[PDB]
Write a protein that binds this ligand. Sequence first.
Ligand SMILES: Cc1cc2nc3c(=O)[nH]c(=O)nc-3n(C[C@H](O)[C@H](O)[C@H](O)COP(=O)(O)OP(=O)(O)OC[C@H]3O[C@@H](n4cnc5c(N)ncnc54)[C@H](O)[C@@H]3O)c2cc1C
Ligand SMILES: Cc1cc2nc3c(=O)[nH]c(=O)nc-3n(C[C@H](O)[C@H](O)[C@H](O)COP(=O)(O)OP(=O)(O)OC[C@H]3O[C@@H](n4cnc5c(N)ncnc54)[C@H](O)[C@@H]3O)c2cc1C
Ligand SMILES: NC(=O)c1ccc[n+]([C@@H]2O[C@H](COP(=O)([O-])OP(=O)(O)OC[C@H]3O[C@@H](n4cnc5c(N)ncnc54)[C@H](O)[C@@H]3O)[C@@H](O)[C@H]2O)c1
Ligand SMILES: NC(=O)c1ccc[n+]([C@@H]2O[C@H](COP(=O)([O-])OP(=O)(O)OC[C@H]3O[C@@H](n4cnc5c(N)ncnc54)[C@H](O)[C@@H]3O)[C@@H](O)[C@H]2O)c1
Lengths: 521, 521
Amino acid sequence: MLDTNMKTQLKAYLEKLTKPVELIATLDDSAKSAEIKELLAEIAELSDKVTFKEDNSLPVRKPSFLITNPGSNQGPRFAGSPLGHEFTSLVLALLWTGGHPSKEAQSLLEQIRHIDGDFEFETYYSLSCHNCPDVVQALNLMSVLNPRIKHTAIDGGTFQNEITDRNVMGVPAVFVNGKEFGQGRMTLTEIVAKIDTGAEKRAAEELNKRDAYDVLIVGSGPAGAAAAIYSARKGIRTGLMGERFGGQILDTVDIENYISVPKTEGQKLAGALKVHVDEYDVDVIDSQSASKLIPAAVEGGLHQIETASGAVLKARSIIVATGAKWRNMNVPGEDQYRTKGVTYCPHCDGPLFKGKRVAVIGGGNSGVEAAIDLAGIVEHVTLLEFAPEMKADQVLQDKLRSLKNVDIILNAQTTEVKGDGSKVVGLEYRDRVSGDIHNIELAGIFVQIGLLPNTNWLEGAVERNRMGEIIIDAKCETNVKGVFAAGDCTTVPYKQIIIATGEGAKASLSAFDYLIRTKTA
Amino acid sequence: MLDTNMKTQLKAYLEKLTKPVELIATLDDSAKSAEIKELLAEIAELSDKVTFKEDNSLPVRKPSFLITNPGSNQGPRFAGSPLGHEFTSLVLALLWTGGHPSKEAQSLLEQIRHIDGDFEFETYYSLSCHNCPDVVQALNLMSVLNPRIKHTAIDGGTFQNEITDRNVMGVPAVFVNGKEFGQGRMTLTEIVAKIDTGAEKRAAEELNKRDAYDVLIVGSGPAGAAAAIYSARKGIRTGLMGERFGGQILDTVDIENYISVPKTEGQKLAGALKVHVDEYDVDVIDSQSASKLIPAAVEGGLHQIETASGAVLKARSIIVATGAKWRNMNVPGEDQYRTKGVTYCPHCDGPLFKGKRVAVIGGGNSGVEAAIDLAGIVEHVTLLEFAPEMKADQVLQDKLRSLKNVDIILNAQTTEVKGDGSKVVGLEYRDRVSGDIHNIELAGIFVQIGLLPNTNWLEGAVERNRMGEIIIDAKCETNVKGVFAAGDCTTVPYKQIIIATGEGAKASLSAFDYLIRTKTA
Ligand SMILES: Cc1cc2nc3c(=O)[nH]c(=O)nc-3n(C[C@H](O)[C@H](O)[C@H](O)COP(=O)(O)OP(=O)(O)OC[C@H]3O[C@@H](n4cnc5c(N)ncnc54)[C@H](O)[C@@H]3O)c2cc1C
Ligand SMILES: Cc1cc2nc3c(=O)[nH]c(=O)nc-3n(C[C@H](O)[C@H](O)[C@H](O)COP(=O)(O)OP(=O)(O)OC[C@H]3O[C@@H](n4cnc5c(N)ncnc54)[C@H](O)[C@@H]3O)c2cc1C
Ligand SMILES: NC(=O)c1ccc[n+]([C@@H]2O[C@H](COP(=O)([O-])OP(=O)(O)OC[C@H]3O[C@@H](n4cnc5c(N)ncnc54)[C@H](O)[C@@H]3O)[C@@H](O)[C@H]2O)c1
Ligand SMILES: NC(=O)c1ccc[n+]([C@@H]2O[C@H](COP(=O)([O-])OP(=O)(O)OC[C@H]3O[C@@H](n4cnc5c(N)ncnc54)[C@H](O)[C@@H]3O)[C@@H](O)[C@H]2O)c1
């Protein structure tokens, strides 16, 4: 039923065929199926690539024909007339199946080439309908790429029997596996979204496709936030990846040394940090953990960060700001009284305990200094050391034995934090030697047993001191060109919010200075 | 007229005499003056120190007698009876004048021993009055110490003539140089305040008397404020001296990078800094300039700071935080448009000039980097260099010549900042070679010609790099034990409020650590 106009175009279009096409028909003696025999044999006669065969004992509609390459039995199936408005749908099916490429976004085409679900699409059309080809062609494309996605386009003029049995007022009308899909306009892009609803949001593929960063900051505590703002203000492409925006301050409650702010709160300062950040062009990535730094193999090239989610980001410059974790005792009641008397930092919370009795857990330098600190502010201090002797510098140990409101207890293992449901009221411990249990009444417990920088993921790539801290010069420079670090994760002598924010800003200005110096062409 | 009780005490009290006393009388034949002859000769007869002479041609009241040491004619003069309630006033005058000491605050006594004004005090009393001795004795004491302060105590029973001529309803009643002074109760302490109303508030003597500080912080910008809060929170004795509380931020207007605070203002942040400070025990000294550090000559001893006012303060530890001054062009209109388009820092203000044309003044590193910075943010940048070539690292000069929105002008001396009464609209300059005048239209002028740390007052005492910055390690330690430094005055690579506050806190924690380590007895 091809008109001469269609023939000439079709002859011209089949000249753009690089693979051999076969049309496999299933026909039933009716004059409609005779009309489709004629057509297939007309088309076959127009090209040496195109062969018309027929197999009339297949479990598919009659009349219909599979378009395919030799051997393989995968491709678009038309039932009834592939003419009218669907003429250009038919040329396209032959072309694609014969090696011509899709004229649309190849990213989607790969996405489609990899899909797991088994889908038969059967679209219902009729020859008169103007808006039906775009849906037909769409789902045609799909059937060629992935062999799991089958597609039968159905002319309503030939199957009024199926039009009624299954209600179809209005075409086009598609039916994914004997189930209503959708009607009217649908672009391929739009089709593929809905089909992969039970998709799997590969946000790691989102991340892998991003452009290189001018600076990528790893860690979104105070240090990294501060660095993100200073970087964004220079207008450079800036990224800020971290596990949890706000770092340590988020789990903090009463904060009284953020300079200029007599009293604030962790959740609030963290929100204030997020607001300042969003005042600038900063791609904030949350809930994402860095697992490896790969240093650029040449100056002027790019460093890489690997995430635990399997993504890889790329940056002209990196800033590490991943902080530290204070070690816990891991005893009953420790959790329960976190921020209600059990604390870590003596700098931050010391003043809250004037007049009160406290304990320091840990006999290292950090614990011993902490006790000499608290001793001046508070009424009584009890230091408890797990080992049979204190580890701290002698100078400090003698100074602590000099004060009149302090007790040292050796071989003392804290077993329980006690409180009243609201606040700490005491401590239980055992003598690791005789096994004897003991009780202290107090209002505060300062755990000073070790800081652990979050840097074991950097082993081998940047240099660390012997406590795990990232070694930095005054400019926050690491031993790798174009990698800087700021905050508690580094060798800064002290760990405070106000100190960490200053270092992030430094690291940012140092990173910018390195970008502008990276030479020329 | 001495009764036997008075004699016995007086005999006992004159035994406490270390110098020779002379009573010089002026007497007029009346039986009152005969009554004072008798008395003087009774007293003379009670001690070998006390001699009674009389000179009856002196320009003073009759009867009266000067009490004094031989030769010299200075001391308390009584007119009429020095008896009744004023008996014990008389013993005291003889004792003090004969070398016995004042039983009251010797600080005041030195203050009084040094006074410049010429004062005759004449107090009016009468024998019956209970509250008159304390005023009489007070002003007696004064007359012995300083020889400029004369004092005649006047018995009203003998001079009813002067009681009426000069109205005196109610005693005691004192008259500094023929002029009403005061009536009723007056302590010496209270007398001396009022007499030195035209005193001179030696606030430097206030400062010289203060106890040693645990830490003395020099400079009350952000760095020193931050250090004062961290120090005070440890409860140590802390002092914060500076020229002007708030440092550089006070003259600053729009501040958009104080981390956590999207927009604040200089005068406000400075007030917020003052409030946080006053939340703790910090002796704030304002309007006071340090002129010299004298390092302790031994560990465990005290450093000293000399002020321009001549005061000297003492501290176990010092923190220097005296900042820097950006160099000005010193041209007409520079002042006028300070904070209205003329600025110093490109980090702070760069973002305000998106789309705008700007100039950078200065072809050093700081200027050239600044131009490469602004070039990315802004539409056009014009760098003007006073010399015939730029000074900056070559790397940077080539990078600046690489950009497409930049002009370099050599031998260019800015002559005028132009505006519209509100904001900068352009710049005038001369070619230092041909002398030709030129004009540029712009909205911003970034002056980048040199930072000058405020540290020339430290020459020789602590070590400085070659740009004048105080050399510090990561711990803010200087090359002198127990002296630390923080903020723009030091070698920190960048000068920002958030960076300076972090350094002040560091320097504080480092200073505290040094205090606790300073050994033992
Ligand atoms: C209970 C408590 C109370 C405190 N109170 C005060 C106080 O009153 N005042 C004060 O000044 N300081 C206080 N501090 C300390 C203060 O919070 C720290 O100085 C500050 O948070 C350090 O900031 P930071 O940016 O360097 O690191 P962090 O705050 O620890 O933030 C680093 C961030 O990076 C994340 N991260 C870690 N590893 C990775 C990775 N591989 N990839 C991506 N992200 C990663 C971390 O989970 C965190 O979110 C307190 C700390 C605690 C624990
Ligand atoms: C116009 C302008 C705008 C700025 N805008 C910003 C901005 O938007 N953001 C930002 O982060 N930074 C900004 N800055 C810079 C910021 O103010 C500095 O980083 C910061 O003030 C440095 O603090 P500081 O404590 O180290 O020293 P300073 O702020 O300079 O304070 C030191 C103090 O010590 C005093 N002093 C000096 N000598 C002595 C002495 N011998 N004895 C006693 N006291 C002494 C000084 O007069 C001053 O009061 C700006 C600076 C200027 C000039
Ligand atoms: N300046 C800082 O803020 C900072 C912070 C952390 C570490 N550091 C430095 O790192 C080094 C490590 O010193 P440190 O004191 O942090 O660690 P440390 O390992 O040297 O001392 C830890 C001590 O805790 C004791 N201990 C452990 N578990 C205990 C428990 N459950 N109960 C009681 N006692 C227990 C151990 O016996 C040991 O004495 C030092 O050089 C220190 O100066 C510095
Ligand atoms: N990182 C920082 O924030 C910081 C701040 C200040 C200085 N520095 C360092 O100190 C050194 C000094 O560099 P710098 O650039 O501050 O100073 P510089 O003296 O090296 O350069 C100053 C330049 O200004 C030019 N100049 C002076 N007056 C001028 C005028 N009125 N008009 C036009 N041009 C004029 C001079 O010709 C000279 O080229 C460098 O090593 C720099 O890195 C660093």
